[model samples]
Target: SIPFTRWPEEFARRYREKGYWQDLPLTDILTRHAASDSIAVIDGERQLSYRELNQAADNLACSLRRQGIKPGETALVQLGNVAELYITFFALLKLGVAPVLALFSHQRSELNAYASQIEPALLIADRQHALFSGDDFLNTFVTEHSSIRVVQLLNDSGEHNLQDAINHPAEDFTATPSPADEVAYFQLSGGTGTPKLIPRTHNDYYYSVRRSVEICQFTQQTRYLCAIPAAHNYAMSSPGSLGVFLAGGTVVLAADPSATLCFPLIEKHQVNVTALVPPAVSLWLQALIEGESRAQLASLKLLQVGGARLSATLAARIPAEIGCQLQQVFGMAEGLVNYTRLDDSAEKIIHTQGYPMCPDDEVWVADAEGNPLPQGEVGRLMTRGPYTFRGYYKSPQHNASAFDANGFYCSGDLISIDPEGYITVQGREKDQINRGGEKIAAEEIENLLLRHPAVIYAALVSMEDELMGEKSCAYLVVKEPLRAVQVRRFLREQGIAEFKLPDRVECVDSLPLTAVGKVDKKQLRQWLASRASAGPASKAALREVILPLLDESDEPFDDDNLIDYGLDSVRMMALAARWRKVHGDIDFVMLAKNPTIDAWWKLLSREVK
Candidate 1:
């Protein structure tokens, strides 16, 4: 009755005989290296070897069982990049329970979203995070949700504190009853709206982990610095800590990826390799140039950038500046990973995102007609492979639209798969901007802008417009002052169409990104809308709203002189756009208005329809 896509029995049998599906559960991965004394985890002080890590997981499993958590149960787990996250993850796998691994950044919104989908039997979270912390938030949550029998945390607090659960023996310990074909754990989608959980079975996910270990050339000596969210698919099994543990390597957990923390940790730990998104690589480059710890990264070997496309110019900078090899990873939570092989030509590694992970991994780069596109053309990338998830967990409606008749999972990435099997990412189809009915690929414009020596970073996103349905806006982070004219001249020099040119250019300290490190265009769009030709109706409406908002009843209404009305930051941003036509080009910076309709009333005073 479950809606999760399953492998056909015939294929499963074949995969088993062919030695691909071991039918071994995830904990079996640890069982391999558990006999060894090699270091497995390093997070500040709490270091654990293969033996200790496995034992810790076993203990946690036992303790969870003590709290009445059983096999085949579902859990909602939220934790940062701490050792406990990994320990708890492995524990759930060991007990044959599936966990929806939520990011530590997740608050009630995400928790509520997951809770609604799967009424978890238990909750595993870090206590330090606001929602789970002091003064009985956990009590309130558990009181509200009856299905939640138990809640666990990182610190010690009797049954609730999981770290304390580490040494106790369980009276009712069970064997690994989970099969390779069964669901192991849930992975999260970085796609639209609310988070959708992807059910990853043991056979499929284990294959990806084992394959990634080989492809990324991870060995026992490898020191992997997990910079991104540990629960994220890219950092988890794009040869992440899981692969490191498989190889019995040292896994250094970094709670924060900023250069201040990471650079020092890299130096102290003699870290050889780490994974990061594209934005992080630039920050590292900048910090290395500006900061004094140039000598800190001497032991660094390889850096993998994924989650978003890394520009070729930026890809080339890793080896030149940080003195390490750059590996481009392109994949998602649903699976189908592409990696630049170590032996790949430097030029290929720099330019292409890399090739598929498994040889039998079927990938199709097809046009709108569903016919396969040639090597050079960008098309919707589709795949049905060994490791790629067959369906999202319990999402039949979404799945119906997400997959094709041939059973290939639609990746949503507009990539050109080479005849030789390499893929070049050209932005997502949704990420493309439509201006006056003409389409512009944001990646193309951003790439061109980055080619200019003055710009360190650039993001081209579409903004709402009066003339065109939508117009392009470029947000830039430059080395020095860069005028909009210089940017336009640079693009014009590239001989691009005028429609593709950014209608507005703005400088910013940095671009906002999602939890997984993809450009947070939703945020940029909101910022642009809030700051651009903006605001709402007349001062009368503004006063109507602001008068109630103002604390004092006896406040003086000096219209032009705003000091009497308490024009704080909130007032300046209390503005919006609301006409049938024309984006209100008002005092977006109206500190006095804060999302107020200061000048928007005047913009709407044009010829009526």
Candidate 2:
């Protein structure tokens, strides 16, 4: 069987006692509903009922078993938003073959990374994708990776075609499932560099999906619009499609999240619910204003926005303009999903990212040192829950740092909890930035930039944005002259996701260094704020105002506590009063809390109304 990090015996026993860890396999979710004739999925024109969906999955499983694919092996699957994706997913589960569902946007580099880690025995892909539109890349990849024994291509004809397997049915075949505690499938982490594989076991994943259905209030009448990549943890099981399945609801698949495409599907299917990242929400809002499609979205009841921080302004517009209740979702692939209760007040839903889903979820809002912070103080968020996984697949070194002594997953998100347990995500402490909800790791892009022959040194940092929560800006010290367009083209040619490319590229002589000789990203961020469209209280401007209060010999880093650098409380109150005219929220207590330029700028950089 495929090995994975298991929950400690005590925790496992506790979970079982609490009835969260059911021994039933994931396939049971579909199997129990097999007799129902309710519409399970709508992929454009083709719609499948629960019975048809179950039969299709069984047929595919039988065909795979005939091809020597056995239980306990793994498969690498890459397909877009389609019915086949779901069919293939269940088929693998029915046969006890775990599959890593790669996002359609992933190209050669990401596919290679996942393949190397799992050493998958079967390869499933969509022919429509650019990499598979031709045989050249596949031929070379298959030749180099000898572990992939069976290849199934969607939208292709003949024996190896996925559609063919779905069409053909075998008389009988042995079906086995991995133990509920063992890894059922892999969910890709949205962190830095090569994505880590999160081994989601059947018990844990099914519990999440089942609970999501309850929390989201999904029912037989629920028509969910899956507009994002179907494989995303948010779209897949954040009470995603699987929740829709468990609830016996209908799932309408969209090719993309654009208003042009999804509006019609929503109208046609009367899609009452859907999920989107902040960027897509912006596009849909604009598209509604530009076009006469408000009528098309008349049936949309709840619009779930997540993946990145949704600005309050955008969150407010959904209810006012779209006429739908807005539900703010904040969760991760590893586990721990938060959803704004449907009955929550508009103010709470708009301002906070909601509380944990499970009753047993243990949340910690603590300082950098891991000690719990005072109530309502901002700190890094850490969680341990029944649904949350213990560790990444075979990543011991990373797991050591990712989790705390008590096994709480130290999610790098910086957040604070209100008196009511609602969380307000401050920002991320990770070396990654959420660009319109798509995570871009600084180290990954920096390493890619350094690969260019002209690029000698590269540093990437986040720039505040009104649209995307943040955008990447790369400061490069190059041997030769390089234009921004040329640098982007080079990175694009490297087959990285387009969103990972730096939004702005700068050619600089040298990068600022921290006290330890590391590239001073905080300094770079301060420099970015100077030219940013920030108000008078930009980081550079804030520094200029506060610098003269201290001696030049006592130069301070951006993160250095200003109070420690001779900035007395009397002067701090005066400074706060002065900045209050420009930023009405600035106060002595707020400034005194963190007492750093970086922390103060974080406050000042709030989205202007």
Candidate 3:
């Protein structure tokens, strides 16, 4: 038998004594709470009690079953933050069809790749994403892949084919029995590359929710406003839709993930719990500083920030401005979420990623060779727990390298552990960038840029920024006759996440290379720096090339008039977003500091060279 960990001993003992474990296909654990008549979900303008939530799920499950969706079948679901996501997730659970949650942004770039990998029997998407014509995109892809069935959910009240499925006569849909180890959900890794599918099983997800809810002391009274993407691992599990359902708590869904949308909800709903990233915190701070929303975020009792490091400056200001408890969550989608709880102080919440959830969920820092590092020394963070992922999807090579001989998942994050057991992140092992809260892989964007027809080769790098912390920039050796805008347009067409596309694309005749012919990115960064320091000549060359094509109005323009020369915030943001896609570390302040061409070139040469 698997050894029980100390942290959940009481809860586990009580659950076992009550025979809750006897139920097959563990999702019934959530259904049990529906009988209590507590409110489960609250989207804008609508509410679903737990009883209603379960019935809607059941109704959807019956519809799915009639369409021949069975146990072990994977179903791809694309939707926004709506009641549909919750109902569809539970419905898939009831039918035992593993549901892969896809963010709306995922639709922009990685859809085709994800569809091929999971090879789902059905594609369930909302018909109204602004970027793509849904019917055209889905029909094209689905028609090309015979193995998949397409189902679209439209917000309009008019009759559509989906209604035939939704309005199907309700039947007693039995939960398909399966071993606890059977995969329950597929969570896609971020970035524009071939998405890495995270297989979360019934046991893994259920235990994670239970542990997180318990760790956060989530009671029926806990009212959580889920402000982030519902599909993300942190939001999905920790006070995610599932957490709220299990605790019979309130989940207030925000229409947009912006601070503008979320702040009002916090005040109106009296939301006790919410999660944010450093970028969101910055926006809130700016709003407070500018006196935009001064309602004293009094309703929030606990605020959890993670997915990116929160700077000491930002952390220090939270209590003074928002006057709420701040907690940091650091864990993986696979399992083992460490969080500062209600009992922790503001300082503890601001600094550490908190202690381990269960005793068996061990955390330690290790050196390059995997030996445990001394306390307070930064090293790769590793974790071992009952709830962590068993392995990557069918990739034995990755599985071998990812786990140690002792079974710990080698988390690629760099961190330091204190004698008191608090974990503080220091850096990263992978070439991934945490833009705002969104994780964008540098190699992923680089690979996409190389796909352009005119691109001979490319190097993507992160430039530091104050607001975002890091943004992406791309340097390229083009095949001749191609401009930067052409490259940008190609990436845009690929449906890449707007944030991951290159903000600034520089066309170079040749790139610095190592002895082995690999592009020496470090040296290339230096090249950018040297060019920047060269000043007005470099600025003139760039402007001569780009400005004329961007706008033909030959109104006189010079260095002094650059800001007035139509270098507006929109263009700046676009440029910053591009750089962020290539290098996740580039922040907005870095971009602002060197907004001019000469300034950036100098900055790059100095820092990189």
TM-score on alpha carbons, each prediction: 0.72, 0.86, 0.80
Off by over 4 Å in 2: 514-518, 527-609
lDDT of 1 by residue, 519-539 (tens): 577677776567654433455
What are the lDDT figures for the candidates, one per model? 0.77, 0.88, 0.71
lDDT of 3: 0.71
Off by over 4 Å in 1: 1-3, 156-159, 170-174, 430-609
lDDT of 2 by residue, 1-609 (tens): 787788899999999999999999999879989899999999988999999999999999898888888888999999989999999999999999999998898888888889999889899998898898878988988987898889999987756688889888756665687888888999988785667999999999999998889898999999999989898899999889999998889999988998888888999889999999998888889987886568888998999999998989889999998999999999998899999999999999999999989999999887987899876999998899989988998889889988988899988899999999999999788888788777778878888888999987788888788778789888898999899999989998998777887899988877776787556776777755664534344689888978888666688999998878888888889878877876788899988989988988887787754
Put the candidates in lDDT order, highest first: 2, 1, 3
Look at candidate 1 and tell me the lDDT of residue 200. Answer: 89
Candidates sorted on TM-score, descending: 2, 3, 1
User: Candidate 3 versus the native: TM-score?
Assistant: 0.80
**Candidate 1 TM-score versus the reference:** 0.72
- When 1 and 3 are scored with lDDT, the better candidate is 1
